[PDB]
Design an enzyme around this catalytic site. Structure first.
Site: not given
Ligand SMILES: [Ca+2]
Ligand SMILES: [Cl-]
Ligand SMILES: [Zn+2]
Ligand SMILES: [Zn+2]
Ligand SMILES: *[C@@H]1O[C@H](CO)[C@@H](O[C@@H]2O[C@H](CO)[C@@H](O[C@@H]3O[C@H](CO[C@H]4O[C@H](CO)[C@@H](O)[C@H](O)[C@@H]4O)[C@@H](O)[C@H](O[C@H]4O[C@H](CO)[C@@H](O)[C@H](O)[C@@H]4O)[C@@H]3O)[C@H](O)[C@H]2NC(C)=O)[C@H](O)[C@H]1NC(C)=O
Ligand SMILES: *[C@@H]1O[C@H](CO)[C@@H](O[C@@H]2O[C@H](CO)[C@@H](O[C@@H]3O[C@H](CO[C@H]4O[C@H](CO)[C@@H](O)[C@H](O)[C@@H]4O)[C@@H](O)[C@H](O[C@H]4O[C@H](CO)[C@@H](O)[C@H](O)[C@@H]4O)[C@@H]3O)[C@H](O)[C@H]2NC(C)=O)[C@H](O)[C@H]1NC(C)=O
Ligand SMILES: *[C@@H]1O[C@H](CO)[C@@H](O[C@@H]2O[C@H](CO)[C@@H](O[C@@H]3O[C@H](CO)[C@@H](O)[C@H](O)[C@@H]3O)[C@H](O)[C@H]2NC(C)=O)[C@H](O)[C@H]1NC(C)=O
Ligand SMILES: *[C@@H]1O[C@H](CO)[C@@H](O[C@@H]2O[C@H](CO)[C@@H](O[C@@H]3O[C@H](CO)[C@@H](O)[C@H](O)[C@@H]3O)[C@H](O)[C@H]2NC(C)=O)[C@H](O)[C@H]1NC(C)=O
Ligand SMILES: *[C@@H]1O[C@H](CO[C@@H]2O[C@@H](C)[C@@H](O)[C@@H](O)[C@@H]2O)[C@@H](O[C@@H]2O[C@H](CO)[C@@H](O)[C@H](O)[C@H]2NC(C)=O)[C@H](O)[C@H]1NC(C)=O
Ligand SMILES: *[C@@H]1O[C@H](CO[C@@H]2O[C@@H](C)[C@@H](O)[C@@H](O)[C@@H]2O)[C@@H](O[C@@H]2O[C@H](CO)[C@@H](O)[C@H](O)[C@H]2NC(C)=O)[C@H](O)[C@H]1NC(C)=O
Ligand SMILES: *[C@@H]1O[C@H](CO)[C@@H](O[C@@H]2O[C@H](CO)[C@@H](O)[C@H](O)[C@H]2NC(C)=O)[C@H](O)[C@H]1NC(C)=O
Ligand SMILES: *[C@@H]1O[C@H](CO)[C@@H](O[C@@H]2O[C@H](CO)[C@@H](O)[C@H](O)[C@H]2NC(C)=O)[C@H](O)[C@H]1NC(C)=O
Ligand SMILES: *[C@@H]1O[C@H](CO)[C@@H](O)[C@H](O)[C@H]1NC(C)=O
Ligand SMILES: *[C@@H]1O[C@H](CO)[C@@H](O)[C@H](O)[C@H]1NC(C)=O
Ligand SMILES: *[C@@H]1O[C@H](CO)[C@@H](O)[C@H](O)[C@H]1NC(C)=O
Ligand SMILES: *[C@@H]1O[C@H](CO)[C@@H](O)[C@H](O)[C@H]1NC(C)=O
Ligand SMILES: *[C@@H]1O[C@H](CO)[C@@H](O)[C@H](O)[C@H]1NC(C)=O
Ligand SMILES: *[C@@H]1O[C@H](CO)[C@@H](O)[C@H](O)[C@H]1NC(C)=O
Ligand SMILES: [Ca+2]
Ligand SMILES: [Cl-]
Ligand SMILES: [Zn+2]
Ligand SMILES: [Zn+2]
Lengths: 696, 696
Positions: A215, A333, A370, A379, A399, A574, A612, A635, A645
């Site tokens: 999705t 974790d 996660e 989501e 985390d 440049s 703001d 970004h 990643k």
């Molecule tokens: Ca989605």
């Molecule tokens: Cl964290």
């Molecule tokens: Zn984690």
């Molecule tokens: Zn993990």
């Protein structure tokens, strides 16, 4: 008084410990009944603690599980077809947990099914540069081979992508003691090292910010129209499975073919680390066979969303979020983080019961799934994107509170640097030898900035956690903090027991933080940040800190390009526009800072207008068209590295246009794209600067 | 007092007349010196009138011009190659302008060069349904033919796209008297009809909101990296040229092949309107030859941007914008609008000199290169998109003030319906027979709403003017108003002299509005809207009006789908989610309206919070992913029709998924896409609704 000190003093190490124990007695795998029950418990407790509202937000997303009656394993087979060696079906459970039900066996989430059979090639860490070395220098072809790679250095999803593009027909991931066994430390349960039977779980998706594979762009609600599996985002095309180093030694020990190209390819096992393909003469007719039968299934997940409504600016949101789902017990974790969030909610609630409210609204989140690709946070952000982009002040992740016990680690937007410096100066150091000194002092001594004397290291945000949607898709100022190991000895692979069954309450209480003082310090940092963001009259963002880093990043990207002086001449490449934009940003930011401190203090509209401007500054770095082939990384300053990643890359559009450019067959086209990315970056920097100019 | 009445009373018909004369003595073609000089004049006068700042914003964009020494024309050629008939090289200039220099001859802007030679096919208005009739019912193949089409009914760019997709190798556009010669009215200069030598200029791009063909997404500034011409957005692939009806009669009179399929294919010339291909027996070896030598050239354009800074909310922008560039003299298009903007600026400036300021900032714009594809407005919006999307309250367009003299025409967002109704009740009708009655009364009598007794017709915004970027890309509440002809006799082709040399000051002063009373009324509507938007304490938007139209649009799209009941059963196509979203929107909007009138009047943050909810409501209908293959049309409720850029389409994603669906070879795929668009629409409506819920 109800001030930050009242909030911080209410936080207790002993409460964090109690919560961590409570959260880690059974597995809380995403999509399972036990993780739904924990969601309901957290919802109930956050209500008791005093939040104004606490709701569950559910979605139906693609998850992945092994088949309970058809287990995953890898074999060495002989020419007759006999499986002469099999990898383990499960990690030996730790003491006192050998009867715990529903421990998911090690697997690579989202692997397709298959039983590929072939010759092994050893690919080191399966990084882009490892595959360059194999293919370009050593002339070894991975096409139709099963690759074996050691975990570490980069996100495992990148390893799988790289193997797939090299033509591998399967991937075996393993934990080498070189990367997951610290010298002089005992294996769990007698210390914090990974035993030979221990295995790291983890997803192998390449989602690039998409969220639920089925999705992209829209929440996975009850009427969602889903992609077919063949058009899903980010799924691997070849089977993948993780193993421990006892089993890896059995696969590696017979390897023949070429020698490793140098010592950076050799781990710590007593094997030669030959690249292959295949085994040495006597075993040359033996092959490796994977057996993967995991399934992908749309499954319900549940986020807990708690609200503490602001007294003055209830339409401005400061978000503290961390996940709840774990691979097994989640001792570090995520529950070392979740226990900290729980105690922060309790403290804020204590103030609320006494009649206090924060200036701005605080949202608290317990995210689901996660571990399967940031699915729950993404989501929810997709559902609420309009609210978030017009009202979102900041996102603080929560985390794991610890990955070591040496010093503080902070990764955040430059907008938060000043806030972090100031807060840590007012907090006590928990470190041995720094009794009575500030956390700023211990942190600065142990983790010096590479660039400024007397300041600490703060890293760029990468990805691999629930801040990704907020920061790189939506452009909300984000940050994270935890305790970490020594940056000197830090080999960028994490703690040994990561995503293993051995990650337990006892690991933490015995070996990491027996007094829960590092947890308490992290609670004070994360909570103190949320407090200041939600209560400071002027938002605690310093735009001048963005100006400084922008110049550093411009210098860096220019220096990459300047390795190709001839091409820069030929194609008139440049960087002048980017440096001009950065100079302008610097000048405009300085003038804005003067107004922010010179502005009429009594005027709330000038205040709201200036707040703001501060809020929407991060937002100004978003390009609605996204980065090339990565529409959810919007970004322009920061994206997760295309090669890893976990690592943040600055000016990612330009960086990826320059990467390996000397190997591109059409240099005119390649350098044209470099110039296009320079234009995009310069424009975005200037546009961001202009949001800080006088408004009319 | 400085109130709206003071502003409206300062507006003078005589000033509008003086300005119109001043703006229409020489051509002001985009990219020419004369249009730069007019920009500088307007800048200087807006400063004199009292604006706080007035700047030029320039861009270098792709424009298109004929070759002065190699003129465009069309021939009938004989089998020997002799050109036996040539179309005109220029329109006969009107009385007293026969010595005016730099009248651009008729051409289709952005036509490629070519000299294609072939047989004619007559394609009526070259609409999608005309090509269906030819190809599907009549079995006539346009591949490799030169098509001749009459102007009218749809945007000419759509005609060209349709001809190109039918395989035409060139297009001839002409003005038929059926569409551009009103019975009983004399040809210019003796009345307002199009003479036989008159020709309509106009661009033939299909930009879909992109702006400058070479820089989609980013402003065409001094360091912009441009696409090559082969990757430019929206350029036609076949030559195109416009002609008058004297020349068209000579091309049509010899046509043979099939008869027109019915009387809706026959215009008013004394020719049979045979479809072809080619000419009748005696002339069958003759062919038609185009000669097009126009060039595309990157050329500088200049917008004038005037600011009147707000006293209380200077970071909130109300924009009044209209273009300056004209095809020739621009007597109606655009200078009848620009003269009105000029007088509005003068009036606001008069109040400012007496010490008044509006609550919010007002921006005034004189856009360039609108005639070449909305280029100036779109490049400026691209440059300033971050400012606009966080601060933009509303955009009021100000192109032609008149297209007739019968009654008012308003096209706008539902958010402005209430504002328009209330304002027109307080304005005097300028109409004969309504002396002493309100404009609301005359407008309602002459142009009744098709749906509610006692209310006037207000249309959906389409496109083909400078509001497009603001509304369908950025999601800023937009509207337009002008005087128009009778909706009963309105054949949807505009006024006869549209984009002709004959569009002069004298046309307007003699035949449209001798007393400039319709111009004054339009100035009061456009200016009164800007005044209320910029000064009302609570923004004058009624969200409940959006709820009403959303239900009407949902009913309409469902009724289109319900022509395919079997397929809806087979593929389980439900509109339930969309109707649920609309119901929710209706309920939430009603509750928001109660709070808006019940809310603590003394609390400016509750006020600013509620004003932000109103401001960002239009914004909530934006999907950052855009519509399919149209990334710059991001509004989910409204887009320009894929078949006619001038017409607005509601729920365009669903509409285009349903269009001609019975002809799609893979119905499962086609209906899957219908369901995907239903999901997107329902989600967006619900998300928009949720922006009006209590914020925490
Ligand atoms: Ca989605
Ligand atoms: Cl964290
Ligand atoms: Zn984690
Ligand atoms: Zn993990
Ligand atoms: C960092 O911030 C500075 C502002 O301090 C920006 O400076 C602008 O830079 C551009 C690009 O160099 C300048 O562009 C030039 O504008 C000239 C006309 O400027 C006047 O009129 C304009 C409106 O039309 C006003 O905005 C302006 O105040 C001036 O009064 C043009 O004539 C120039 O074009 C000519 O030269 C170029 C280059 O040789 C040729 O290619 C052209 O064909 C033509 O001959 C040019 O376009 C602009 O004036 C500067 N604005 C200032 C000083 O206010 C930087 O651009 C900004 N950096 C970034 C990355 O945005
Ligand atoms: C218009 O506005 C209304 C609100 O008035 C929205 O109503 C929601 O509609 C959805 C879809 O029908 C409802 O979804 C259902 O939620 C059930 C659980 O709800 C409770 O717990 C949640 C959090 O987890 C709370 O938010 C909620 O308040 C409840 O306390 C699920 O159990 C349901 O799933 C089961 O049934 C379905 C359908 O048969 C099966 O497919 C599932 O497998 C499962 O068996 C279901 O998901 C939601 O509760 C409604 N919210 C309300 C009433 O507050 C509309 O959705 C909205 N319209 C649009 C277009 O958004
Ligand atoms: C982190 O802490 C530092 C040091 O306290 C903060 O900087 C200081 O901020 C104050 C308040 O704005 C500044 O005071 C101002 O001084 C000027 C005169 O120089 C005066 O005109 C103003 O009225 C006001 O009193 C102070 O100069 C400044 N000190 C510095 C930069 O050394 C900083 O803002 C904090 N960061 C946050 C909250 O993110
Ligand atoms: C267009 O004009 C109409 C009619 O004047 C405006 O609607 C009216 O708005 C006023 C002011 O908000 C409403 O007054 C309120 O009445 C309630 C009691 O019913 C009271 O509690 C409030 O304190 C306030 O006095 C009035 O009811 C309402 N009339 C209607 C809907 O018939 C409308 O707002 C104008 N549109 C704009 C400005 O866009
Ligand atoms: C390696 O395993 C195979 C397969 O065994 C099955 O899967 C295992 C993971 C576990 O669940 C076993 O209990 C299953 O039987 C063994 O090969 C099988 O051996 C059996 C009994 O001799 C025979 O009837 C099957 O046909 C074999 N299946 C296949 C696919 O070859 C093998 O013996 C094991 N090897 C070692 C060294 O232990
Ligand atoms: C139709 O025009 C052609 C071309 O004439 C040129 O282009 C015109 C638009 C205009 O600018 C003329 O002055 C130009 O000469 C005529 O054909 C040409 O005729 C001349 C003189 O007889 C001859 O030398 C050229 O070779 C011809 N060129 C071509 C391309 O055929 C033609 O006579 C005109 N027909 C009519 C009926 O007037
Ligand atoms: C974790 O803590 C929770 C909250 O104290 C415990 O759940 C409670 O258990 C008691 C006794 O079974 C019940 O009467 C309460 O209704 C529960 N409260 C809730 C869910 O809010 C839970 O037993 C603890 N878990 C562990 C493993 O110790
Ligand atoms: C349109 O009006 C403008 C403004 O009155 C005229 O431009 C002025 O012309 C006078 C006399 O030539 C100059 O002294 C002024 O400097 C001009 N003012 C400006 C440009 O602001 C212009 O002549 C008029 N045009 C026509 C066609 O009448
Ligand atoms: C799991 O494997 C079993 C037995 O080997 C098989 O019958 C079943 O279909 C599989 N389950 C799933 C969910 O694919
Ligand atoms: C690798 O192997 C396959 C043949 O099995 C071949 O198609 C491919 O081109 C080879 N690549 C190289 C670089 O040799
Ligand atoms: C905790 O700190 C002590 C003190 O240096 C150290 O010896 C121990 O190894 C640390 N634990 C971990 C898990 O790093
Ligand atoms: C215009 O046509 C002339 C003469 O027929 C030619 O020399 C010139 O190159 C053309 N101009 C452009 C701008 O293409
Ligand atoms: C139209 O004409 C060309 C042949 O010149 C042919 O390729 C095309 O398929 C034809 N189409 C139809 C529908 O007959
Ligand atoms: C202007 O109004 C009069 C009155 O009905 C009408 O006869 C005339 O044709 C109108 N002009 C135009 C251009 O429609
Ligand atoms: Ca552009
Ligand atoms: Cl208009
Ligand atoms: Zn116009
Ligand atoms: Zn026009």
């Amino acid at each position: 008084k109800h001030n930050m000190k009242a909030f911080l003093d209410e936080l207790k190490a002993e409460n964090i410990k109690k919560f961590l124990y409570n959260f880690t007695q059974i597995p809380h795998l995403a999509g399972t009944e036990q993780n739904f029950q924990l969601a309901k418990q957290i919802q109930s407790q956050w209500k008791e603690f005093g939040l104004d509202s606490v709701e569950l937000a559910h979605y139906d997303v693609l998850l992945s599980y092994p088949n309970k009656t058809h287990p995953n394993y890898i074999s060495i087979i002989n020419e007759d077809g006999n499986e002469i060696f099999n990898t383990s079906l499960f990690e030996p459970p730790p003491p006192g947990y050998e009867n715990v039900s529903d421990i998911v066996p090690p697997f690579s989430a989202f692997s397709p099914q298959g039983m590929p059979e072939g010759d092994l090639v050893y690919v080191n860490y399966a990084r882009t540069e490892d595959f360059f070395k194999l293919e370009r220098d050593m002339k070894i072809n991975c096409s139709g081979k099963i690759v074996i790679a050691r975990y570490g250095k980069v996100f495992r999803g990148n390893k799988v992508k790289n193997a797939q593009l090299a033509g591998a027909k399967g991937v075996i991931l393993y934990s080498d003691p070189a990367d997951y066994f610290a010298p002089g430390v005992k294996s769990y349960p007698d210390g914090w090292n990974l035993p030979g039977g221990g295995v790291q779980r983890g997803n192998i998706l390449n989602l690039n910010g998409a969220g639920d594979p089925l999705t992209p762009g829209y929440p996975a609600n009850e009427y969602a129209y889903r992609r077919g599996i063949a058009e899903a985002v980010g799924l691997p095309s070849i089977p993948v499975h993780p193993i421990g180093y006892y089993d890896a030694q059995k696969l590696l020990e017979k390897m023949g073919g070429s020698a490793p190209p140098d010592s950076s390819w050799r781990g710590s096992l007593k094997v030669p680390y030959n690249v292959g393909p295949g085994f040495t003469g006597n075993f040359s007719t033996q092959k490796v066979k994977m057996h993967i039968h995991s399934t992908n299934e749309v499954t319900r997940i549940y986020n807990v969303i708690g609200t503490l409504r602001g007294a003055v600016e209830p339409d401005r949101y400061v978000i503290l979020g961390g996940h709840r789902d774990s691979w097994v017990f989640g001792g570090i974790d995520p529950q070392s983080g979740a226990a900290v969030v729980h105690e922060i909610v309790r403290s804020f609630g204590t103030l609320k019961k006494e009649g206090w409210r924060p200036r701005r609204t605080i949202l608290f989140a317990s995210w689901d799934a996660e571990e399967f690709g940031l699915l729950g946070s993404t989501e929810w952000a997709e559902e609420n994107s309009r609210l978030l982009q017009e009202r979102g002040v900041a996102y603080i992740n929560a985390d794991s509170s610890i990955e070591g016990n040496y010093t503080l680690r902070v990764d955040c937007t430059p907008l938060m640097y000043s806030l972090v410096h100031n807060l840590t100066k007012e907090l006590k150091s928990p470190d041995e030898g720094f009794e009575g000194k500030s956390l700023y002092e211990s942190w600065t001594k142990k983790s010096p900035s590479p660039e400024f004397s007397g300041m600490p290291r703060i890293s760029k945000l990468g990805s691999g956690n629930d801040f990704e949607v907020f920061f790189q898709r939506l452009g909300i100022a984000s940050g994270r903090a935890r305790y970490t190991k020594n940056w000197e000895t830090n080999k960028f692979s994490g703690y040994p027991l990561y995503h293993s069954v051995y990650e337990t309450y006892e690991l933490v209480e015995k070996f990491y933080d027996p007094m829960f003082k590092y947890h308490l310090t992290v609670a004070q940092v994360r909570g103190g940040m949320v407090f200041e963001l939600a209560n400071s009259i002027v938002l605690p963002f310093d735009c001048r800190d963005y100006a400084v880093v922008l110049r550093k990043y411009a210098d860096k990207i220019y220096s990459i390009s300047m390795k190709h002086p001839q091409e820069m001449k030929t194609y008139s490449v440049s960087f002048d526009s980017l440096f001009s934009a950065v100079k302008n940003f610097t000048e405009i930011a300085s003038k804005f800072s003067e107004r922010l401190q010179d502005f009429d203090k009594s005027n709330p509209i000038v205040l709201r207008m200036m707040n703001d401007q501060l809020m929407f500054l991060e937002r100004a770095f978003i390009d609605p068209l996204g980065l090339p082939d990565r529409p959810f990384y919007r970004h322009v300053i920061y994206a997760p590295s295309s090669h890893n990643k976990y690592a943040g890359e600055s000016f990612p559009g330009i960086y990826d246009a320059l990467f390996d450019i000397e190997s591109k067959v059409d240099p005119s086209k390649a350098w044209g794209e470099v110039k296009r990315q320079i234009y995009v970056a310069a424009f975005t920097v200037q546009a961001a600067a202009e949001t800080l100019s006088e408004v009319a």
